[PDB]
Amino acid sequence: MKKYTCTVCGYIYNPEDGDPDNGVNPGTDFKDIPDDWVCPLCGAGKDQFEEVE
Amino acid sequence: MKKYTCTVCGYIYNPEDGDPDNGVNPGTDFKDIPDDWVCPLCGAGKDQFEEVE
Amino acid sequence: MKKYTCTVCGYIYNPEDGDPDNGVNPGTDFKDIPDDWVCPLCGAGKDQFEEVE
Ligand SMILES: [Fe+3]
Ligand SMILES: [Fe+3]
Ligand SMILES: [Fe+3]
Numbered sequence A, B, C: 001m002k003k004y005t006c007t008v009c010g011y012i013y014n015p016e017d018g019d020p021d022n023g024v025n026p027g028t029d030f031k032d033i034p035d036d037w038v039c040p041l042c043g044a045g046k047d048q049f050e051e052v053e
Helices: none
Strands: A004-006 A049-051 B004-006 B049-051 C004-006 C049-051
Antiparallel strands (some): C004 C049
């Protein structure tokens, strides 16, 4: 699975880690995260993220 | 022609339906969509899409 | 690289120009701007910016 970065603050969503404290379990692909989830560090929406590659 | 999904919001581009409101007619293969077209639901570019399955 | 717009005042961050007098050199992608940088016209943080197309 691909990592994604928050364009507003640079937070990296790592699929292996997930974001469990906000209900995104380890191993969740970014496309499968609920579309109301926001960046844990700056509150930016998913639409402000892009693939690392 | 295969379906493609926006990995940022989960939108599925289906070639049989196209995206006629933004000038992408039914029968347009994903690679042939004008490269300035974005995801109708979250504004992500074609570079954030992935072939389904 | 994508241009970003300040939703508070309309200032456009252009990656090719950067914002050199506030330490952001030409060629800096918005996601790589240090997170304490603000819009030079209105003081808005990076969180008030949105990608243009
Ligand atoms: Fe963020
Ligand atoms: Fe999308
Ligand atoms: Fe501003």
